Design a protein around this ligand. Structure first.
Ligand SMILES: *CC[C@H]1/C(=C/c2[nH]c(/C=C3N=C(/C=C4\NC(=O)C(CC)=C4C)C(C)=C\3CCC(=O)O)c(CCC(=O)O)c2C)NC(=O)[C@@H]1C
Ligand SMILES: *CC[C@H]1/C(=C/c2[nH]c(/C=C3N=C(/C=C4\NC(=O)C(CC)=C4C)C(C)=C\3CCC(=O)O)c(CCC(=O)O)c2C)NC(=O)[C@@H]1C
Ligand SMILES: *CC[C@H]1/C(=C/c2[nH]c(/C=C3N=C(/C=C4\NC(=O)C(CC)=C4C)C(C)=C\3CCC(=O)O)c(CCC(=O)O)c2C)NC(=O)[C@@H]1C
Ligand SMILES: *C[C@@H](*)[C@H]1/C(=C/c2[nH]c(/C=C3N=C(/C=C4\NC(=O)C(CC)=C4C)C(C)=C\3CCC(=O)O)c(CCC(=O)O)c2C)NC(=O)[C@@H]1C
Ligand SMILES: *[C@@H](C)[C@H]1/C(=C/C2=NC(=C\c3[nH]c(C[C@H]4NC(=O)C(C=C)=C4C)c(C)c3CCC(=O)O)/C(CCC(=O)O)=C2C)NC(=O)[C@@H]1C
Ligand SMILES: *[C@@H](C)[C@H]1/C(=C/C2=NC(=C\c3[nH]c(C[C@H]4NC(=O)C(C=C)=C4C)c(C)c3CCC(=O)O)/C(CCC(=O)O)=C2C)NC(=O)[C@@H]1C
Ligand SMILES: *[C@@H](C)[C@H]1/C(=C/C2=NC(=C\c3[nH]c(C[C@H]4NC(=O)C(C=C)=C4C)c(C)c3CCC(=O)O)/C(CCC(=O)O)=C2C)NC(=O)[C@@H]1C
Ligand SMILES: *[C@H](C)[C@H]1/C(=C/C2=NC(=C\c3[nH]c(C[C@H]4NC(=O)C(C=C)=C4C)c(C)c3CCC(=O)O)/C(CCC(=O)O)=C2C)NC(=O)[C@@H]1C
Ligand SMILES: *[C@H](C)[C@H]1/C(=C/C2=NC(=C\c3[nH]c(C[C@H]4NC(=O)C(C=C)=C4C)c(C)c3CCC(=O)O)/C(CCC(=O)O)=C2C)NC(=O)[C@@H]1C
Ligand SMILES: *[C@H](C)[C@H]1/C(=C/C2=NC(=C\c3[nH]c(C[C@H]4NC(=O)C(C=C)=C4C)c(C)c3CCC(=O)O)/C(CCC(=O)O)=C2C)NC(=O)[C@@H]1C
Ligand SMILES: *[C@H](C)[C@H]1/C(=C/C2=NC(=C\c3[nH]c(C[C@H]4NC(=O)C(C=C)=C4C)c(C)c3CCC(=O)O)/C(CCC(=O)O)=C2C)NC(=O)[C@@H]1C
Ligand SMILES: C=CC1=C(C)[C@@H](Cc2[nH]c(/C=C3N=C(/C=C4\NC(=O)[C@H](C)[C@H]4CC)C(C)=C\3CCC(=O)O)c(CCC(=O)O)c2C)NC1=O
Ligand SMILES: C=CC1=C(C)[C@@H](Cc2[nH]c(/C=C3N=C(/C=C4\NC(=O)[C@H](C)[C@H]4CC)C(C)=C\3CCC(=O)O)c(CCC(=O)O)c2C)NC1=O
Lengths: 172, 177, 162, 164, 324, 285, 164
């Protein structure tokens, strides 16, 4: 895997170039955010059990056929594996948020997830609804203050929303 | 193949939602900035022959082992195919700029282009540099910063269209890698 | 690639857990040191050609047989001289990559993995590249903690060569 | 989707050419016509639950035989699926005014419909009587403007001619 | 775009998006004297179909300038032009003279008929025409059996139909179609399973065994495997590809079996450490950790989630999962 | 420095401010360089020819090139020395005809193509509407370009892959009351209370139907299970105080010909609204 | 004959469908953009005798070696056929403005040209060099209107990319 600092280095080694003066000034801004990025990863991780469970609770209220006999989440092994997957996706979205690059997200979670759910019969349109419910529980948790100093984080919540949309289109 | 308007339709169809209110304003903005998009697609297809020849020549000038015996662009059959491999890639990028969505570039061009280039034996580092040269040419004609041509436009800013077409060219390098 | 960011992800993904404050502090310390490292990399980039021409000449002064002996391994001809100023620029570029990333990652993936195999095969001496690196440690002109970050990756490559 | 963009791109892809001056001239028609057909798509998306339910019982006001035994409006589930299937069709007309062509109606509503409404024995003249009621309910200055009602009714009788 | 959901479509995002959009139907028996633009499009469309999206240069396109002119007034395009272009040297050089007989036989099924050979008897009926009468009648049996006038109007260009259900083929022929047609930016020179020299469906087209379909543009889209016998009688060798059967006690212990195909295995990235290992780089015996990339596995269901993590954490790319 | 309108505009340093085609040479410090060029190559005696790029040529200059003209003052020197030509002296536009070559002040014999009224100097084009101005004293000719004469021998050091590839930041677009609903689902259900089912959104009206059976939010409330033993008697009140009111006095709105009734029977759950509720009013209890 | 009308009628015929609402919208763009190009073509009509004379001198100025004995511009008779062959290209772009697309260039001027010129030993770069001159002497608010110059330039670059 490689983060956002290692991303521009790998793009520059393949050209055989030193980094520019403009490119160092663009990596100073990524360090200048710095603490605001670590606030989003702190808020998402600290409420990780309640984000997964209460957005599984709201999925079975709107699609109650998934827990009927003959549904894809009806049994204890088949329900516990469903909550386990929703915690796997929230894990690698927080990994992609601390790194600034969606490379650990697809190389270790997403590549082969569509092929897995097509061999098992898991409804892929219902997985993306569970992904989109953890999204707006987390982008509403991102832009509340709650012991953070007041400022503008609207550029880092568009990046966190883009990692949830990436995980949702790799399964739908 | 989806355009910009039919992309928000397949996003609304996934949740049985009508298109209206919040989503129609981002599409009314597409119509209001729509004269710029036709005025920018015209700038690329008016120079589409000089763009391709200068991209394959500049790929060769920096890496002159490609025209040696053992290089991929050695003979005349191979050089004429490399001049045509890039003329199609530029054609599909100008479709995605006209549509406003990268679905025609991914469906008809990039899906399968990777295993095309590993069966033939095309060097992916050299083909990325030929795309990179076309990216610099496309932003220069859109933002009128071309050092060899001065196209006439109305006055205004089109940075969002140049940052859009730059993201289409980076999908070409990420696919074949 | 070894980075303070990616080594925190890899030690939590190996255990299979979320990023705790054990991992949020290892990337907090990368952000404190990043200001010294980014000024050390902007200065080594802007004075690269001075440091490349000087370090190659500093090897021809200590080892003058490398500009004398015939053969392909030595910098006798103009072709072996051009392949030496290319080797110094590879060692210098990996140092500025390690300062930008924040760890000894880009020079592991690109330079020091397989380094003892390509030196013994093409018959290059690691003592040539040490003296080329002792010059850059003595001539970058950096000061304080800016020089502490630059000399930490220069001294890392001298330990693999020796 | 069949649209204005996807027609002129596919025509210039089968010929293997760049977007010509006549392919940019068609997207200018998509600009001057978008004002009327987005007014109809916004008027429909705000008042859709009242338009669907007004047309859902215009089926059963013309065909009261559908509550007879064995028919398609026997029980509560079958009228829930009937008001759903009308609301599906009104969503696709909202999708066609947004895109600008008959794309979403063709691929999602019309293709395969003759083989389903005959296998499941749903009378296709009653999936029409709700669509034909909405086309004559529209008052041309009251709900929308003049050219917004031209676009709204032209997608409404494309669906009628495709079920007939 | 990939997937099956989000658009209510599976075949256009399986590589067939350009092919599901054209007719190219030649609506008039002769070309009108005065105009060339309509019929130049049909000739470029029947070059792209009959040659399988190959590059015909201008010095080679002038070698077929005679037929192109017989078609413009006094020949059909389905018959008598695709038949004339198949007897040319440009078709014969790259589709017949390069491969064995059974390799040339299924390239003609794709190019002329738009499908694949179903079983051995589809191969065997076409090799018998070549043994008795030569190449000139061999390409006529693709045109002059019953199938060709049945499925194509004699003024349209041929199109691909080996995936459809109205082309009454076996379901192993569906999986074989997506081995020979990989999207619209590919030819059979640009196919990794036939590189204008091989037999693309050799064991699989004869025995009618089905393959796992990997979509073009997927993550593990570069997956290819070799062929080798395994038994003592045929003098085979063990340990190259995983089996396709799941026979014994391990088939149903740990649940239902699957067959997983991995693509990219490199030397950097094995350990739990985010970076390469510095030092010796190779053990004594000098071999890699994975001597082949493109490995395959047969795994149970209770071992599928530990294996999934063991693949991706070590650099691999899952190409396909298929229940045995 | 001073005002340009002093001494008329007859001064040489103030004349190009007056003939306002090249305003970038005084907005930047470019006019110090071309005065230092003609010191350095002694062009003050012999006649020569300049090709000044206009305003608009400086504006269409690329951001990967305009950065490299700031971090390298040597690159600004020979680019401005690449516009001063000493081949034909004070040459007019009629002597720039045909095809040929031109010798710069520093750079090297840049080729020109001059065909009638269109004249190119190699990645440049002379606008001939204002280009034949000749100064008598310190004598040269000055012509106006629309692009800088950029030789390709200088700019192999520049590219767009340095970091000048333009990127726009994409925004999210959520509404403030759109989530304030969604923060209550982040807490666990022992401390979030009723608010733990806040993530369910409004389904369409047929999704609560008897094939699908989507569960409403109010069930997750105790207001669904309000089933008491006690009951109001309604006869112990004064007559005129018990009020009742029907929904509509119509046979056809209470029940249509189909069963899609909003008021009678089990089809009262098939409303397009009333799927979610306001239970972020109270507490996290 | 590629036009805006010809592209949608041929695409409705290829799918066997009637003219939809996606097809009449493309004819609307032909109406709006008509006033731009139809007065550029009026400008090219009455002033073609001087535009080809100016463009004719602009290729023998660049390639003065054509007047050598043994080249394509030896005598007055071979010179007269070059001013004729550039007057044809100015008539075929006058046709492309009143049609609305690259039809009349693609049939009578471009298709077949690169084998006529190769066989008859005529350099295509000099048939280029007179087309790129009238693209360059065109300044947009003097010679025509601001939008007529966009259409007039759009066909000259289409002719240039075809020869080159
Ligand atoms: C609410 C979630 C939806 C859902 C999920 C569901 N998933 C499974 C089974 C598996 N999922 C995986 C995927 C992964 N495993 C991993 O370890 C990782 C990390 C890299 C990923 C991405 C695997 C391997 C399995 C099978 C093994 C198992 O866990 O039992 C199941 C069970 C399917 C079954 O038949 O048992 C469910 C139910 N299904 C839904 O209905 C929801 C929409
Ligand atoms: C008289 C029998 C016929 C015959 C048998 C034959 N079989 C093999 C090889 C294999 N048979 C199996 C089948 C199984 N293996 C199992 O463990 C189970 C339990 C579920 C079954 C059903 C397998 C997997 C093999 C291959 C592995 C192996 O060789 O041991 C062979 C050897 C084949 C060879 O060429 O070496 C023979 C001879 N063959 C005949 O001719 C008889 C008709
Ligand atoms: C100068 C040679 C050309 C070249 C070689 C090159 N090869 C690799 C990588 C691998 N090679 C193998 C092959 C084997 N491994 C074995 O153990 C055996 C005996 C069974 C063989 C035949 C394998 C498995 C790899 C990948 C794993 C590894 O790194 O060892 C590479 C590295 C490519 C990479 O990105 O890792 C190179 C560069 N390349 C050239 O350019 C030369 C023409
Ligand atoms: C001061 C220089 C001394 C010297 C240098 C010299 N080196 C070579 C050849 C090679 N050097 C490398 C090293 C690297 N390549 C890399 O890509 C990287 C990481 C980015 C490193 C560290 C390699 C692989 C070679 C051989 C391959 C090649 O030819 O490029 C040579 C040429 C030797 C030859 O046999 O061709 C010289 C002369 N030698 C001296 O005399 C100086 C003291
Ligand atoms: C076609 C002639 C257009 C035109 C195209 C542009 N090219 C631009 C940049 C560019 N060109 C090259 C190739 C050139 N450089 C070389 O070193 C060699 C030989 C080995 C050649 C042929 C390169 C490498 C680049 C830079 C790509 C990059 O940045 O990575 C360009 C950008 C700006 C400008 O020049 O104005 C354009 C527009 N330019 C023209 O004038 C005509 C119309
Ligand atoms: C009321 C107007 C009718 C009536 C209608 C019924 N239609 C029924 C089912 C049905 N409708 C469709 C098409 C619909 N589904 C879609 O996904 C889309 C487009 C996105 C559309 C237009 C389908 C495919 C089906 C069958 C699947 C299903 O059960 O929903 C229906 C149910 C049939 C049944 O119960 O067997 C009814 C009752 N009923 C009436 O009385 C008049 C005729
Ligand atoms: C725009 C680049 C300049 C400008 C140029 C001038 N053009 C002059 C004369 C002229 N130009 C043309 C070609 C052009 N005008 C047309 O009507 C058409 C075709 C419809 C074209 C291509 C012609 C035919 C003529 C002669 C007739 C005339 O306009 O007088 C001109 C006068 C000097 C000369 O060239 O003889 C100038 C200065 N004028 C401008 O204001 C901008 C800067
Ligand atoms: C954005 C989504 C938030 C928000 C973020 C801000 N945080 C700011 C400063 C700040 N944050 C932290 C905590 C963080 N740093 C760490 O080292 C660790 C754990 C290891 C964490 C969780 C600290 C320590 C600081 C102090 C640094 C400083 O004050 O600069 C901050 C800057 C305030 C400002 O400049 O206005 C912002 C904007 N604030 C918000 O309102 C939204 C909700
Ligand atoms: C030039 C930038 C490259 C390079 C290019 C070559 N490509 C060659 C053949 C080839 N390319 C494609 C893909 C192309 N065809 C399409 O239809 C589409 C998109 C829809 C694309 C991008 C195909 C299918 C083929 C095979 C042609 C055939 O089978 O006849 C090629 C020829 C190789 C050869 O002749 O052996 C070259 C040289 N190669 C390079 O070195 C630079 C980097
Ligand atoms: C025009 C012919 C008459 C006229 C007719 C009336 N329409 C009445 C109500 C009404 N009409 C519609 C359909 C229309 N409105 C929409 O929003 C849409 C599509 C989005 C359409 C096609 C609806 C849905 C309704 C009910 C809601 C309402 O307007 O109250 C109406 C009132 C009586 C009735 O309930 O039908 C009349 C009289 N009105 C006129 O003034 C001209 C003469
Ligand atoms: C009745 C004499 C009052 C009155 C009562 C209403 N209460 C409504 C909802 C409600 N009530 C409570 C308190 C109750 N629940 C408990 O768990 C406990 C003790 C631990 C008590 C005392 C709660 C928490 C709630 C909200 C939860 C729910 O709705 O199930 C209510 C419905 C309000 C509405 O939604 O319209 C009514 C009418 N109101 C009166 O007018 C008399 C004075
Ligand atoms: C009618 C069909 C049609 C064409 C023939 C072409 C031509 C064209 N371009 C623009 C108009 C424009 N074109 C651009 C584009 C640019 N300007 C720049 O300074 C950049 C260099 C470049 C890309 C960013 C801008 C900024 C406008 C102004 C109008 C707007 O902002 O929408 C207009 C609108 C002007 C008007 O209203 O008259 C037209 C008609 N485009 C079309 O839509
Ligand atoms: C209606 C559409 C139409 C066209 C577009 C042209 C295209 C065209 N031009 C020429 C023909 C020509 N083109 C040139 C041109 C040149 N020679 C030079 O010195 C310069 C290189 C260049 C000046 C522009 C000459 C000299 C001929 C005549 C060839 C000859 O005499 O051998 C011919 C051959 C027949 C002939 O005219 O003799 C044709 C078909 N003609 C058409 O009928």
């Amino acid at each position: 895997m490689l983060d956002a600092f290692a991303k521009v280095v790998a793009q520059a080694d393949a050209r055989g170039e030193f980094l520019s003066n403009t490119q160092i000034d663009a990596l100073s801004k990524m360090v200048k955010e710095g603490n605001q990025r670590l606030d989003i990863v702190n808020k998402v991780t600290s409420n990780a059990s309640a984000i997964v469970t209460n957005s599984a609770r709201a999925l079975f209220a709107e699609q109650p056929q998934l827990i009927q006999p003959g549904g894809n989440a009806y049994t204890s092994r088949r329900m516990a594996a469903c909550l386990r997957d929703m915690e796997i996706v929230l894990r690698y979205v927080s990994y992609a948020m601390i790194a600034g690059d969606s490379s650990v997200l697809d190389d270790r979670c997403l590549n082969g997830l569509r092929e897995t759910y097509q061999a098992l019969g898991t409804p892929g349109s219902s997985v993306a609804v569970a992904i989109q419910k953890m999204k707006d529980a987390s982008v509403a948790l991102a832009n509340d203050t709650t012991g953070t100093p007041i400022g503008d984080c609207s550029s880092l919540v568009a990046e966190l929303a883009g990692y949830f949309d990436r995980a949702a289109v790799s399964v739908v | 193949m989806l355009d910009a308007f039919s992309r928000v339709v397949v996003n609304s169809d996934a949740k049985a939602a009508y298109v209206g209110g919040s989503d129609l304003q981002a599409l009314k903005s597409f119509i209001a900035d729509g004269n710029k998009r036709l005025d920018a697609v015209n700038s690329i297809v008016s120079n589409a022959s000089c763009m391709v020849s200068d991209a394959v020549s500049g790929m060769i000038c920096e890496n002159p082992g490609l025209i040696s015996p053992g290089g991929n662009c050695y003979t005349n059959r191979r050089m004429a195919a490399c001049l045509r491999d890039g003329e199609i890639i530029l054609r599909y990028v100008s479709y995605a700029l006209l549509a406003g969505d990268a679905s025609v570039l991914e469906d008809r061009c990039l899906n399968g282009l990777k295993e095309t280039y590993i069966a033939l034996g095309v060097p992916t580092n050299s083909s990325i540099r030929a795309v990179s040269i076309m990216k610099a040419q496309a932003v220069a004609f859109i933002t009128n910063t071309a050092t060899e041509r001065k196209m006439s436009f109305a006055a205004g800013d089109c940075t969002s269209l140049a940052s859009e077409v730059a993201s289409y060219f980076d999908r070409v390098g990420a696919a074949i890698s | 690639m070894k980075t303070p960011i990616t080594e925190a992800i890899a030690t939590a993904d190996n255990q299979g857990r979320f990023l705790s404050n054990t991992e949020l502090q290892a990337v907090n310390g990368r952000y404190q040191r990043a200001t010294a490292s980014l000024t050390a990399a902007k200065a080594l980039t802007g004075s690269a050609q001075r440091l490349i021409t000087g370090a190659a000449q500093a090897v021809y002064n200590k080892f003058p047989y490398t500009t004398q002996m015939p053969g392909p391994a030595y910098a006798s001809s103009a072709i072996g001289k051009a392949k030496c100023a290319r080797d110094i620029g590879y060692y210098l570029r990996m140092v500025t990559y390690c300062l930008v990333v924040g760890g000894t990652g880009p020079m592991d993936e690109y330079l020091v993995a397989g380094l003892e195999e390509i030196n013994r095969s093409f018959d290059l001496s690691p003592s040539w590249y040490i003296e080329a690196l002792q010059y850059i440690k003595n001539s970058h002109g950096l000061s304080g903690q800016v020089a502490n970050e630059a000399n930490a990756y220069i001294d890392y490559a001298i330990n693999t060569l020796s | 989707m069949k649209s204005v963009i996807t027609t002129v791109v596919s025509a210039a892809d089968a010929a293997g050419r760049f977007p010509s001056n006549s392919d940019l001239e068609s997207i200018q028609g998509n600009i001057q016509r978008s004002a009327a057909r987005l007014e109809a798509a916004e008027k429909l998306a705000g008042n859709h639950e009242a338009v669907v339910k007004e047309a859902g019982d215009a089926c059963f006001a013309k065909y009261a035989y559908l509550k007879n035994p064995g028919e398609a409006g026997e029980n509560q589930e079958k009228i829930n699926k009937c008001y759903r299937d009308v609301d599906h069709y009104m969503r696709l007309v909202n999708y066609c005014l947004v895109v600008g062509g008959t794309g979403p109606l063709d691929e999602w509503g019309i293709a395969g419909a003759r083989e389903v409404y005959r296998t499941l024995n749903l009378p296709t003249s009653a999936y029409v009587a709700s669509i034909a009621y909405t086309r004559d309910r529209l008052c041309v200055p009251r709900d929308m403007s003049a050219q917004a009602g031209v676009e709204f009714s032209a997608y409404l009788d494309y669906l009628i001619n495709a079920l007939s | 775009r990939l997937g099956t959901v989000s658009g209510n479509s599976s075949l256009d995002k399986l590589g067939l998006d350009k092919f599901l959009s054209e007719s190219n139907r030649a609506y008039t028996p002769r070309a009108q004297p005065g105009f060339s633009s309509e019929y130049e499009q049909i000739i470029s469309a029947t070059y792209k179909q009959l040659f399988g999206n190959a590059y015909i240069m201008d010095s080679e396109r002038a070698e077929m300038a005679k037929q192109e002119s017989m078609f413009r007034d006094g020949q059909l395009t389905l018959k008598d032009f695709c038949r004339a272009l198949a007897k040319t040297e440009q078709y014969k050089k790259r589709f017949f003279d390069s491969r064995p007989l059974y390799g040339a036989i299924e390239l003609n099924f794709k190019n002329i008929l738009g499908r694949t050979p179903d079983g051995l008897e589809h191969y065997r009926a076409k090799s018998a025409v070549y043994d008795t009468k030569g190449y000139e009648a061999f390409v006529d049996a693709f045109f002059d059996d019953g199938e060709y006038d049945e499925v194509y109007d004699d003024y349209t260009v041929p199109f691909y139909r080996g995936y459809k259900t109205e082309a009454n083929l076996s379901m192993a022929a569906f999986t074989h179609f997506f081995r020979m047609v990989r999207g619209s930016s590919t030819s059979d020179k640009a196919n990794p399973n036939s590189m204008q020299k091989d037999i693309p469906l050799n064991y699989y087209g004869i025995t009618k065994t089905p393959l796992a379909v990997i979509a073009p543009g997927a993550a593990g889209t570069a997956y290819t495997e070799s062929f080798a016998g395994t038994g003592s009688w045929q003098s085979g060798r063990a340990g190259l590809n995983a089996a396709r059967v799941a026979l014994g006690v391990p088939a149903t212990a740990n649940g239902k079996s699957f067959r997983v195909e991995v693509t990219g295995y490199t030397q950097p990235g094995f350990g739990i450490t985010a970076g390469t290992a510095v030092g010796k780089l190779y053990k004594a015996n000098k071999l890699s950790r994975y001597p082949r990339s493109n490995k395959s596995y047969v795994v149970g269901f209770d071992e599928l989630t530990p294996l999934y993590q063991r693949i991706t954490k070590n650099g691999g790319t899952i190409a396909s999962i298929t229940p045995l | 420095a001073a005002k340009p309108y002093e001494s008329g505009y007859i001064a040489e340093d103030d004349f190009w401010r007056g003939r306002g085609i090249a305003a970038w040479v005084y907005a930047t410090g470019a006019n110090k360089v071309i005065a230092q060029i003609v010191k350095d190559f002694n062009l003050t005696d012999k006649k020569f020819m300049v090709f000044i790029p206009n305003d608009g040529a400086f504006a269409r200059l690329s951001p990967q090139l305009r950065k490299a003209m700031m971090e390298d003052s040597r690159l600004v020197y020979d680019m401005l020395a690449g516009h001063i030509f000493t081949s034909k002296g004070s040459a007019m536009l009629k002597d720039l005809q045909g095809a040929g070559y031109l010798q710069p002040a520093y750079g090297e014999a840049i080729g020109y193509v001059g065909t009638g009224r269109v004249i190119k100097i190699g990645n440049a084009q002379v606008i001939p509407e204002s280009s034949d101005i000749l100064r008598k004293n310190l004598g040269f000719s000055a012509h106006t370009l629309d692009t800088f004469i950029v030789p390709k021998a200088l700019t192999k050091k520049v590219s767009i892959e340095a970091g000048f590839s333009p990127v726009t930041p994409a925004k999210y677009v959520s509404t403030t009351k759109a989530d304030l609903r969604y923060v209550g689902a982040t807490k666990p259900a022992a401390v979030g209370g009723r608010r733990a089912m806040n993530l369910m959104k409004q389904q369409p009206f047929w999704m609560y139907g008897p094939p699908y059976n989507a569960v409403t939010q109010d069930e997750y409330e105790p207001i669904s299970a309000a089933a008491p033993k006690a009951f109001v008697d309604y006869q112990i009140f004064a007559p005129g105080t018990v009020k009742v009111s029907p929904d509509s006095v119509n046979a056809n709105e209470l029940n249509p010909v189909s069963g899609m009734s909003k008021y009678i029977g089990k089809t009262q759950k098939l409303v397009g609204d009333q799927g979610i509720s306001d239970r972020s009013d109270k507490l996290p209890m």
